[PDB]
Design a protein around this ligand. Structure first.
Ligand code: NAG
Ligand code: CU
Ligand code: CU
Ligand code: CU
Length: 228
């Protein structure tokens, strides 16, 4: 359980969608982060992979604002403290808004994977995962925006998938967090995108999995990584 509190880009903080504060107001502030109804700080499990909830989390609506990023710039997402028990991959996608991200229909977004990190070491099962890297970085993840993609407005869908209960069907816990970015530069690629509801299926080998045994490999879920 947790969420993204803050986003650091080019020397300033962009406050996140504070899901334990803003839902409790009739008049919440405008931010670059999508609003959600996930006030339990919880997740979307396999029962929701083909519902709109998987796209940007439960009940999500686009943020009003969009943050510019320098070409090949970094975006640092700062989480609430991630539990070590919640071992799993950290995955990053972009989907073009083809216009203002604040007015997109999320069900039409087509995401391409820009980064993925999974099982890092398995000397002591359940092992060390991307989630553990996130914890070791004081609950932060740094995403680099590719220089090779077409500039424009994009949703960044940043996600941890916790696997501590994933040995049962629908036991994996997805924690997607979306923010609006203005990607800048000279790139030209428009990578093939995957609908949010076609990212994951509840029997995928990286989703329905027993992490407590020795693992010879880990197939990070979702569509293929865009490599340039
Ligand atoms: C894994 C890690 O380095 N965690 C550090 C912690 O040791 C340190 O006390 C804190 C200071 O703000 O920053 C964080
Ligand atoms: Cu949890
Ligand atoms: Cu562990
Ligand atoms: Cu190219």
């Amino acid at each position: 359980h947790g969420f993204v509190q803050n986003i650091v880009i080019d020397g300033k903080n962009y406050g996140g969608y504070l899901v334990n504060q803003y839902p409790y107001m009739s008049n919440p502030p405008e931010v670059i982060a999508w609003s959600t109804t996930a006030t339990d700080l919880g997740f979307v499990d396999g029962t929701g992979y083909q519902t709109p909830d998987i796209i940007c989390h439960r009940g999500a609506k686009p943020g009003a604002l969009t943050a510019p990023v320098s070409p090949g710039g970094t975006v640092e997402l700062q989480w609430t403290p991630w539990p070590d028990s919640h071992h799993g991959p950290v995955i990053n996608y972009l989907a073009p808004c083809n216009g203002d991200c604040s007015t997109v229909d999320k069900t039409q977004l087509e995401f391409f994977k820009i980064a993925e990190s999974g099982l890092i070491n398995d000397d002591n099962p359940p092992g060390i995962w991307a989630s553990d890297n996130l914890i070791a970085a004081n609950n932060s993840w740094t995403v680099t925006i590719p220089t090779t993609i077409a500039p424009g407005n994009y949703v960044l869908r940043h996600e941890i998938i916790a696997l501590h209960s994933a040995q049962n069907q629908d036991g994996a816990q997805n924690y997607p967090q979306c923010i609006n970015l203005q990607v800048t530069g000279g790139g030209s690629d428009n990578p093939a995108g995957t609908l949010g509801t076609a990212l994951y299926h509840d029997t995928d080998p990286g989703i329905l999995i027993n992490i407590y045994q020795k693992l010879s490999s880990y197939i990070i879920p979702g569509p293929p990584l865009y490599t340039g």
